[PDB]
Design a protein around this ligand. Structure first.
Ligand SMILES: Nc1nc2c(ncn2[C@H]2C[C@H](O)[C@@H](COP(=O)(O)OP(=O)(O)OP(=O)(O)O)O2)c(=O)[nH]1
Ligand SMILES: [Mg+2]
Lengths: 406, 552
DNA sequence: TCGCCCCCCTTCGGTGCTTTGCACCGAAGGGGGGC
């Protein structure tokens, strides 16, 4: 079988990212997974003369209790040639976000059937760590299309189409979208009936060689202004500051009348009656924030960015944009676990869901601005990750001047 | 020399080998060098070369801990820069607290370890060197390495990798025997009886010998205490090898640097070590030979450490059937010490956390950082996180992660009452305070001017402006809040337009590298109720507009 | 007059911000320890 030649981007070198510490159970799972991939020729043992490395870890879903090996190829993907230029990329179907139910299937194992350009394999190196450093790290590199590498769906594109064409013409209104190692398959059938034909697609791919989503019920959360019958100076300050911030987003929002209402040097608790020409501004700007912003369209040539804010009692607001103040989506995430007390687990789950929605809607994940200390996130996040992909992120400390999303 | 296959290595693209020249050496290092080289050549470790090879790298010799023997070193700094990058496979240092108790223990070390691993044939010409006769009466002999040389960037990783390959057949065949492998030092523990254990050792040594790795008797430890990785391993406990702290009448910067490093090394088993006051002496200095007089605090800190170090201590070994427990105590000035144990009063190890992260922070954040450092160390050593015992009330932590806007968390922990407890030193009110004065604060500086003003106006008619010199925009805004807290009563409402100042204060810091922010913190702690509100500037908001009119 | 690894403490310089200094962060200097 013949391989496809692949390059890094001009002036880029391969990844050189250090392996981080792993629990006993993850090291064990990685050793058992990698020794069998070794036997099946998917990976090969290497030594230190390969100067590249990418961190490896493992996840174990509650969906399926077997351990899944996860190599964080984010750095390699950033340095790999784009496949829109190579002319072997994957188009996103706009009908996916319409469907009643979308099931995610992990199909990464199909990549192991196609070999990787022998000159590119050295960039896929990873190192298994050692409990109490009893042993030096153990290094492998891929011989086949690796899971988590953005070139694997691109190279496997021609095959997967032939594998799917029978199913999709026997089912012309089910839509299938391949993203990284995943298939997002959406239909408009009853939630049990839909699952029956997911079972049929799995057993169809099984002869050659999940998560239940409902995009119809993903609600956008707008900027709501509070409604009281009596208003203090501080209430009006808070309101004027909120609307002033929203004047960078929405069109024609006014505050001069309320600004005048706070004239003088007043006590923050002094209740101020609302002017006839002040009450109008509120309900007038209430309805500018009613329904969406005009003139904001998705551009597939630019990155998606997601901001998240902790709002307390399990609530998390988020905005997805490409240019500042031009939000393509605003939302509120809320989850039930029954632990009641884990901020990092909630944020990790909020990231996966937001990133999942962006895959369904636009076909790619956004870069997250995470409201968390870098070291707190890195101490715990892998314990809650359940996706076969990993989005890009950065860490911001986020002093909330305005109470704008909640 | 091992028959193992060599690791291929390359020079970085576009580069050549080193052409550096030899320097004089004492004609007692030379005799040792010639004794090593003439014997290395007879074993095939080096080969004579000639003028067709135009490379060279200087040589020297230092003595080994076994006092009688010498160590041959090549100053390959030039070759290393031109040599390809490697991925280092040594990821960390094994710790004795991670060992389980074993019935039978053996410690082995390989003789001439690096010299038993062959070097890439095409790379050998670049290792050219020349051993010197005193006074240059005769020209020196040129050689090249056929094996891994001491001083080359690639030698450690290539040896470690090769040692791992050689050991793997023995490990797979014997999963009941633990082999800690650090470079060429092999710790071998098992639960076999002494007779069967020694048979396994004899078999391991013979396997190493077939692959070219000798195990000399001088380095074959068979009885406790075992000297290993800087420790002493007893059957039931382990100790660190003796730590001798320097004692000086006059201290230089460099002396203090060594002192702090020794104390850090000691802190892994000696509880309560502190180094903040001694390390403060290192700040702002500009020469390692500069004499630094110890401050009174540093003398006290040093004397406390000396008291702790005079006591005998030991760690115990890891019992996988019992929980790991980590207990933390606060020591003051952002210093924290911890102990990790499974049964009470039997420490596996200790440690300390004292890093100052960020310009402004509080004890709750730093405790969280200590927990994260301990959690990472636990994964490294034992492969799991411990249960924590923390000197912080549950109500305190709960008030923190509800009030603080960033996500934060701590794993399973139990409150332990060991004062001083970690607490929040103030909390901003979530609503304005009725009957409290309302201060509208503002500060402004001139960007090119370096002069500014801070001040306030008040719903009770009070007002104040102070002119500031050599200040910034952000400083004047902090200064304006400083004045409001200074002139107000126990309860105060403060309105600012500086998102910067609000961001700092709303995170409830209790310590700061800025003396201005520390003054603010001290005033916040003495208050009874504080509500801090923000409004946008230059939008003529009632109150803020007047104080901004007045800072002009 | 060397190499590689982990740790801590301090300094410095690059990055991004609807900034003009500030906070953050990674690298590099010093030290400890290991072979
Ligand atoms: N470049 C360099 N490498 C060292 C140094 N100390 C130890 N090593 C490396 C090279 C050694 O061959 C290897 C094992 O260390 P040893 O102290 O056991 O020396 P070696 O085995 O070579 O001789 P010996 O054990 O005395 O028979 O670790 C050093 O100071 N500089
Ligand atoms: Mg040795």
């Amino acid at each position: 079988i013949e391989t496809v030649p692949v390059k890094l981007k001009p002036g880029m070198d391969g990844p050189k990212v250090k392996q981080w510490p792993l629990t006993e159970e993850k090291i064990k799972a990685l050793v058992e997974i990698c020794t069998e991939m070794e036997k099946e020729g998917k990976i090969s043992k290497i030594g230190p003369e390969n100067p590249y490395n990418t961190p490896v870890f493992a996840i174990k879903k509650k969906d399926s209790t077997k351990w899944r090996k996860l190599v964080d190829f984010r750095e390699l993907n950033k340095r790999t040639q784009d496949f829109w230029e190579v002319q072997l990329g994957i188009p996103h179907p706009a009908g996916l976000k319409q469907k009643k139910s979308v099931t995610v299937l992990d199909v990464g194992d199909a990549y192991f059937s196609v070999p990787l350009d022998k000159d590119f394999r050295k960039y896929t190196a990873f190192t298994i760590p050692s409990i109490n450093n009893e042993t030096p790290g153990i290094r492998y590199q891929y011989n086949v299309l690796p899971q988590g590498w953005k070139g694997s769906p691109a190279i496997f594109q021609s095959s997967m189409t032939k594998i799917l064409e029978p199913f999709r013409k026997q089912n012309p209104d089910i839509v299938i979208y391949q993203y990284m190692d995943d298939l997002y398959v959406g239909s408009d059938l009853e939630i049990g009936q839909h699952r029956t034909k997911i079972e049929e697609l799995r057993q169809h791919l099984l002869r050659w060689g999940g998560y239940e989503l409902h995009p119809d019920k993903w609600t956008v959360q707008p900027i709501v202004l509070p409604e009281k019958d009596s208003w203090t100076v501080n209430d009006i300050q808070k309101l004027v500051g909120k609307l002033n911030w929203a004047s960078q987003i929405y069109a024609g929002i006014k505050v001069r009348q309320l600004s005048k209402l706070l004239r003088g040097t007043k006590a923050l608790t002094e209740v101020v009656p609302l002017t006839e020409e002040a009450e109008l501004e509120l309900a007038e700007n209430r309805e500018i924030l009613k329904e969406p912003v005009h003139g904001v369209y998705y551009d597939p040539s630019k990155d998606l960015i997601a901001e998240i804010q902790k709002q307390g009692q399990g609530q998390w607001t988020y905005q997805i944009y490409q240019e500042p103040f031009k939000n393509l989506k605003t939302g509120k995430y809320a989850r039930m676990k029954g632990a009641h007390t884990n901020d990092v687990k909630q944020l990790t789950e909020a990231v996966q869901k937001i990133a999942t929605e962006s895959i369904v809607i636009w076909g790619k994940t956004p870069k997250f601005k995470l409201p968390i200390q870098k070291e707190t996130w890195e101490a715990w996040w892998t314990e809650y990750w359940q996706a076969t992909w990993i989005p890009e992120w950065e860490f911001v400390n986020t002093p909330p001047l305005v109470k704008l999303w909640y | 020399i091992s028959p193992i296959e060599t690791v291929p290595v390359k020079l970085k693209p576009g580069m050549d080998g080193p052409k550096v020249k030899q320097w004089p050496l004492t004609e007692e290092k030379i005799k040792a060098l010639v004794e090593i080289c003439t014997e290395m050549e007879k074993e095939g470790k080096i080969s004579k070369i000639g003028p067709e090879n135009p490379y060279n790298t200087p040589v020297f010799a230092i003595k080994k801990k076994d006092s009688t023997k010498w160590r041959k070193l090549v100053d390959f700094r030039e070759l290393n820069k031109r040599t390809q990058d490697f991925w280092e496979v040594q990821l960390g240092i094994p710790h004795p607290a991670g060992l389980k108790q074993k019935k039978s223990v053996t410690v082995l070390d390989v003789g001439d370890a690096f010299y038993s691993v062959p070097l890439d044939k095409d790379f050998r010409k670049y290792t050219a060197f020349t051993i010197p006769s005193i006074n240059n009466e005769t020209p020196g002999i040129r050689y090249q390495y056929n094996v891994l040389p001491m001083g080359w960037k690639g030698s450690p990783a290539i040896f470690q990798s090769s040692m791992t390959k050689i050991l793997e057949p023995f490990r797979k065949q014997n999963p009941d025997i633990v082999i800690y492998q650090y470079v060429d030092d092999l710790y071998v523990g098992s639960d076999l009886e002494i007779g069967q254990h020694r048979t396994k050792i004899e078999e391991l040594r013979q396997h190493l010998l077939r692959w070219g790795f000798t195990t000399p008797d001088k380095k074959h430890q068979k009885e406790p205490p075992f000297l290993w990785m800087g420790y002493e391993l007893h059957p039931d406990k382990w100790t660190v090898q003796p730590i001798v702290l320097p004692e000086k009448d006059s201290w230089t910067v460099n002396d203090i640097q060594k002192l702090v490093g020794k104390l850090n090394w000691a802190s892994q088993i000696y509880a309560g070590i502190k180094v903040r006051q001694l390390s403060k002496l290192l700040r702002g200095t500009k020469a390692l030979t500069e004499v630094v007089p110890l401050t009174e605090e540093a003398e006290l800190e040093l004397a406390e450490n000396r008291e702790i170090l005079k006591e005998p201590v030991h760690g115990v070994y890891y019992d996988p059937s019992k929980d790991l427990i980590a207990e933390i105590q606060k020591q003051g000035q952002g210093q924290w010490t911890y102990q990790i144990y499974q049964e009470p009063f039997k420490n596996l190890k200790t440690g300390k956390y004292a890093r100052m992260k960020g310009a402004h922070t509080n004890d709750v954040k730093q405790l969280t950082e200590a927990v994260q450092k301990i959690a990472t160390e636990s994964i490294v050593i034992w492969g799991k996180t411990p249960k924590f015992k923390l000197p912080i009330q549950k109500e305190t932590w709960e008030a923190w992660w509800t009030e603080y806007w960033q996500a934060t968390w701590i794993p399973e922990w139990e409150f332990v009452n060991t004062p001083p407890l970690v607490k929040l030193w103030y909390q901003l009110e979530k609503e304005p305070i009725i009957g409290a004065e309302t201060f509208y604060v503002d500060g402004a500086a001139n960007r090119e001017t370096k002069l500014g003003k801070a001040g306030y106006v008040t719903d009770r008619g009070r007002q104040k402006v102070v002119p500031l010199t050599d200040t910034t925009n952000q400083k004047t805004e902090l200064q304006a809040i400083h004045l409001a807290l200074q002139d107000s009563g126990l309860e105060v409402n403060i309105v600012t337009d500086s998102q910067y100042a609000l961001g700092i204060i709303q995170a409830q810091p209790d310590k700061s590298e800025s003396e201005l922010v520390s003054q603010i913190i001290e005033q916040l702690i003495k208050k009874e109720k504080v509500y801090l509100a923000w409004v946008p500037a230059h939008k003529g908001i009632g109150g803020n507009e007047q104080v901004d009119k007045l800072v002009s």
